[PDB]
Structure formats: C-alpha cells, structure tokens
Structure 1
Amino acid sequence: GAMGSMERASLIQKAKLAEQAERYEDMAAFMKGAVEKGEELSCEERNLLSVAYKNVVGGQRAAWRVLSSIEQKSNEEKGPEVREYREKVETELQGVCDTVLGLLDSHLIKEAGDAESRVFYLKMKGDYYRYLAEVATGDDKKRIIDSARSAYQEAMDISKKEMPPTNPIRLGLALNFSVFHYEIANSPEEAISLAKTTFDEAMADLHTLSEDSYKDSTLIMQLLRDNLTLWT
C-alpha cells in the first residue's frame, strides 16, 4: 500500500503520465493503488489497468522465453546459472500475475454488475491464469489451465448474452480464448473454430456500426484473421 496516501484522481493522472513516458511498472503501481481505493473502475480506468500490466508481464514473458530457449539448448554446457536466472524471472512473472489475480478477486469481479465490466475482468482473469500456465510444470499445472478456461468460459457466456458480436471486449476475449486453446490447451481445432465463428459473426454485424466503432471492431478482426493465417 505504498500508494495509500495518494488521491485516487492523482493516481489515475499519474498512470496516464507514466503511459506517455513508457514507464509501465510505474503505471501498474499507480493503477494498483487506484484499484485499492475500493471504488469501481470506469471503462477508461479498466483499460489503463490492463494496458499497464500487459506491458509489465509482456516484458517478463519475452525474457522468460529467451532464457527458456537458452536453458533447453544448454540441456541438449554446464552450471546452474541459466536455470537460476530463468527461475528468478519466472518467480517475478508469477508474482505479477498473482498481484493482478488478487486485484480481480479483491474485489473487482464481485462488484462488477454490468456486462462490459464483468466480461472485461473475467477476460483478464483468464489472461493472467494463461500467463501462469505458460510457465507451469508442477502439481497445479492442470488446475491453472482449468482456472483460465473457466474464467474465459464465464466471460464468453455473458458476452454472448449481453453484447453484440462486434463489441471490442467480446472480440478481444474471443481472440485471447482462441490463443488459449491453441497454445495452452493443445486444442488447435477449437482455436480455429472459435476464431472463424467470431470473425464471421462480427462481419455480419458491422453494418450497424458508426465509422469509429467500425474501426475499433475491424482492428481486432484483423488479429483474428492474422492468427487464422498462421494456424491454417
């Protein structure tokens, strides 16, 4: 609670400044402080929170993949250093995911009553369990994978009942859930099916949108198509 003495509005303002400065660790600490004020988050604030932690954990994941590759080639060389340093980065990454999952559990999800907020937070919960699953090997690897799948599934169920198929939150949830199927659950056919069905239902709803909403939805649709091109 190093941010406990700062005003909620000042934390949000500084998160935006940190984003402009590409200081994403600062950004995430500011947004964590804002969440810990206990009030619900607006749409803009939810996106600040996600952007901040996505960039933090993204750097850790990229580092972990570099070190994992070196470790595997060194085991195909001697000394514990590569394993030690990989484990260090892995432990840091797990700590960030635990932090995010802790904010969602205390108490963002339980207070989220609207479709847009509940789906957003359940998608985040799936994402950060997915990041844990990327490095998991031990007793709980299967439990971690099913925590991701369950969060994504609950988000999908709400999103199909409460949001149009072009809604960018719904589209991004489907994109990331399809990545989960391909990369984590060893279910490439499920990944491809979900990406194609999501793309096709969004295409048939584009005619409703304004020009600005059209640009938002088609940007994510392009990512679905990019994945399908990689996978097929």
Structure 2
Amino acid sequence: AMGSMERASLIQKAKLAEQAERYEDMAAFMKGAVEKGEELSCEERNLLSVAYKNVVGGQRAAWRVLSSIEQKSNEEKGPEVREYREKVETELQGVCDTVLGLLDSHLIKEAGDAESRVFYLKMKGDYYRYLAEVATGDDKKRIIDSARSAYQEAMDISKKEMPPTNPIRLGLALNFSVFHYEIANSPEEAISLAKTTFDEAMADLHTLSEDSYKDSTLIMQLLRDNLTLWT
C-alpha cells in the first residue's frame, strides 16, 4: 500500500504520526518501511515497536473490557457481546499476524548483530504472547510454545552477547517474566527470573555512565514493581 512512497518519507511520517498520536498510521508507515527490504536501524526498530505495541495495546484493552462484560453475562443479552468481542479479537489476531509476518519475512533472518536479533525475537515472543492471551482452541498450546521458544532464543543470545544492564536484555527479561506469570502459569519461574535479572543488573550499574544508569535503573524498577505485585 506504501509501495510508492520513499523509505525515508515513510520513516519521517512514522515520526510525525507518533507526535500526533496516530498509531495506526504509524504502524502502516513502518510496515511500508520494513517492506522496502532493507534492515532497520536502532531508531527505526523502536518506531516499529512503538507503533504496533500501541495499536495492539489498545485492542488488548478493548478485548479485556468486552471479555469481562461477556463473562458477567454468562439475563440473556443475545449474541451481540460475544459477536463484538469476537470482532475485536479477530482484528487483534490480524495485527499480531501482520507483525509476526514482518519478523518472519525477513527481519529476523537478516538480523546478525545481537542487539537487532534479540530485539526482533523479543517482539516475536510478545506477539505470540498477545495471541496466547485470547487463544482457546486446538492451537493454544502451540501458540504458547511459540512465544516461549522465541523468548528463549532471545535470552540465550542476550546472556552470551550483552551485559546484564543492557536495556534490551532487561526488557526481554521483564517481558519473559510476564509470560511466565500470566501465560505459562509459572509464577515461581517469573519471580526467579525477575529477581536474578534485577540483582545481576544491580551489580553491573557501577560500569555505566549517568545516562546508561538512568535507562537501566528505569527497567530495574519495572522488574521491582512486578516483584512487589507478585510477592
């Protein structure tokens, strides 16, 4: 759809869309940029993630509202609540499938540096996790396993190639811990992962500049917030 627009113009318009809080547009611009076939820079990977995370985040919030109404209804309200929850769910699945398709064609396979590869495998884990949040059919177990496998490959690379304070490594651990707690029914694994991540980052803060320290400690506090919620 964006095939006739220059890559650089798509990137510029994605930045404008973010400033205007037009995240659906932002995602469409970034999909067009990825489809140009060139690798993405660090900044461009963040535009891609911000756009889709905000789109799917709104769908998730709406799905949860509708799913709560539907569960309470189960006086006869008719088929409408279930139909509308299904509509939002199908839309959400479609966005996740689109993101997974960009990662598979061909972002992950060309990503050789640890920072890019970990970033994309973390995203893959996240969008399978969002599919798992709404899954109930014969493929639920396979969707959960696909998230697990992507996060695990990202973790293995991150532990070999990045310091324990690296923000991508920290955010990956944060999200994989949420996977364990909320999806995999493994709260102890979630707590263990968050605490070991936090403690190993703490012990490496001394190596960091003021700005890197600020970034790492911000994510450490997110880990701590979850640990406080879970314990």
Regarding TM over 0.5, the answer is yes
Root-mean-square deviation over aligned CA pairs:
0.7
Instruction: Tell me the CA shift for residue 77 of structure 1.
Output: 2.9
Q: Deviations over 1:51-104 (max 9, x none)?
A: 000000000000000000000000093300000000000000000000000000
**What is the CA deviation profile of residues 128-149 of structure 1, one whole-angstrom value per residue up to 9, with x for unaligned ones?**
0000000000000000000000
Q: Distance in 2 between matches of 1:155 and 1:175?
A: 12
C-alpha deviations, 1:160-204, integer Å up to 9, x for none?
000000000000000000000000000000000000000000000
Separation (CA, whole Å) in 1 of partners of 2:88 and 2:75: 22
Distance, in Å, in 2 between the alignment partners of 1:120 and 1:77 is 46
Are 2:16 and 1:17 equivalent residues in the alignment? yes
Distance 2:113 2:75 in 1: 51
Local SS of the residue matching 1:161:
helix
Question: What is the TM-score when the length of structure 2 is the normalising length?
Answer: 0.99
**55-64 vs 73-82, which moves further:** 73-82
CA shift in 2, pair 1:76/1:43, >3 Å: farther
Question: What TM-score does the superposition give when structure 1 sets the normalisation length?
Answer: 0.99
Q: Where does structure 2 lack aligned partners over 5 or more consecutive residues?
A: none
Q: 2 CA distance for matches of 1:76 and 1:40? A: 54
Equivalent-residue separation in structure 2 for 1:30 and 1:168 (angstroms): 26
Matches of 1:162 and 1:177 in 2, distance apart? Answer: 18
CA distance in 2, matches of 1:76, 1:210: 61
Alignment deviations for residues 104-149 of structure 1 (CA, whole Å, 9 cap, x no partner) = 0000000000000000000000000000000000000000000000
Q: 2:177, 2:85 → 1: CA distance?
A: 27
Q: Measure, in 2, the Cα distance between the counterparts of 1:195 and 1:48.
A: 26
What per-residue deviation string (whole Å, max 9, x for no partner) do you get for residues 17-52 of structure 1?
000000000000000000000000000000000000
What does residue 208 of structure 2 align with? 209
How many pairs align?
231
Q: Give runs of aligned pairs for residues 172-211 of structure 1, distance below 5 A.
A: 172-211=171-210
Q: Name structure 1 gaps, 5 residues minimum.
A: none
Please state how far the C-alpha of 1:150 moved relative to its aligned partner.
0.2
How far apart, in 2, do the equivalents of 1:76 and 1:205 lie? 58
Residue of structure 1 equivalent to 2:59: 60
CA distance in 2, matches of 1:92, 1:219: 32
Instruction: Give SS of 1:78's match.
Output: coil
Inter-partner Cα distance in structure 2 for 1:6 and 1:80:
43
In 2, distance between residues paired with 1:212 and 1:77?
57
